[PDB]
Amino acid sequence: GASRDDDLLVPYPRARLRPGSLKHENWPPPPAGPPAVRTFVSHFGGRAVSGHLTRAAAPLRTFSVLEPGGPGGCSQKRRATVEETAQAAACRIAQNGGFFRMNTGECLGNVVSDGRRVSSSGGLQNAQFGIRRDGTLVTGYLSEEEVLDTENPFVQLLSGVVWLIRNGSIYINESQATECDETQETGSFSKFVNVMSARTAIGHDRDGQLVLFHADGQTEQRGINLWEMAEFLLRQGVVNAINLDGGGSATFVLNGTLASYPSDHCQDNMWRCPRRVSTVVCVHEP
């Protein structure tokens, strides 16, 4: 019927509730095509791992954040596979997006899909990547006051854990202090950053183009952590980037069909089944 949801990469085993200044970076839009998908099997720390790197021009026109099963997915606490959501949205390239609660399925953190707020952070502060109507690519942390600005408002936005790069500099350490909570253990979260597994990320490059990353693997066995990931991205010319859901949620859909190897297993156990995720990251051409 679906996945067994075994390969879990959880930043917080204890669900966070709804009860150092924090600012964000914005990159103006250079004036300007199809995406550029690149498959690879490269070595990190002596381990070969497979993944994908994507590039798109006109993020304001080719980028979109989708809800599980179409508009209103988060409002109904819905969960759908990247293929189902991508096939319905006719996305050239698609992969899983923000985090969620597996059992309930609601979308956690700020989320903007086509100028519509679908989820709110609720006082919590994590890494977020969004685009404003003027065409500026934003990354980092924003307050709900800035999120709600009606002058050059966000058109597409999602949130993830850790801010991977800021202005061409690694920003993991700066996120470890900001995005870590003290009520939960400090080593359950630090593992989420250091443990090896399949994960995804999103960012942009010096030329003003959107970037999407995906790496296959397994929790503790195969894949990469967040440290190894950022360096490869810097080698690829990304300015700002944030991490996204990974583990069994790591899914890369190309032309509406699965192109990655999910980490989770099927009920039959032998085979790997894609996970039903909340929001999806979509790239297309009108």
Next chain:
Amino acid sequence: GASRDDDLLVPYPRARLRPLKHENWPPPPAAGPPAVRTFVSHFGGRAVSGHLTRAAAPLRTFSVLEPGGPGGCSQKRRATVEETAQAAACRIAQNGGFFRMNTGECLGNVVSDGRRVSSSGGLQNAQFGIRRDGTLVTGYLSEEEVLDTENPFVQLLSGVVWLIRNGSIYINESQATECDETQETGSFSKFVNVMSARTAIGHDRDGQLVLFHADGQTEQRGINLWEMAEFLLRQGVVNAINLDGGGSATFVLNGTLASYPSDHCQDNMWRCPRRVSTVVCVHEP
């Protein structure tokens, strides 16, 4: 728009020039959609990624294609699995028999839509084909029956090594038939023992088609031929044969790439699919 052709797995570095029973499975008496299964399983203590496929009604769901459409081998053409599969609107497709990289010729007996497109030329290798009545053939055959008007072939291709016979491994028995005396004795045995990405084709007792794919790299990542054949046998394949592998190892699903090619691009950093000869296609009315 082409591969760098770095990951080479050659059964014979020295090209052979132009100078025996088979098994057949009758059609059991009765059509579900194909079953594509992603996996990361352990072979000799190392995990490798791949796909395993199965289709019923091979007489109705199986097809052998030429690179870029009909006449591909006749024109010594080379095309990517995606290119050939997209034109045929195949749900599941992967590279097939071997070919000459320099010229582009298709090696071994090949039947695409009931027409012989290439001949073995006196050489004897493992072959998998289907006859119009529904009989599934595997092993070695003489040209008299191949072109015979008795249950003529509708789909046929050739590859190196016969992996399984009647639910039993036939590699040892195949090495004796498929061993050459002109080539060195260690290049071919390595071809069987070396670990890398390869593909295979076979069938089950119920009369269903099977297709296999395993990602990897020559000698670095993947599996050899010994580990590969058994995984299918544990899954209920009766007969199976090996197919082209290495940089040609490609799995295309619904017309799009779903595997990780071993070859590199001219840019070097990225991996590019290789342009192959014949392709195996699976679709539904």
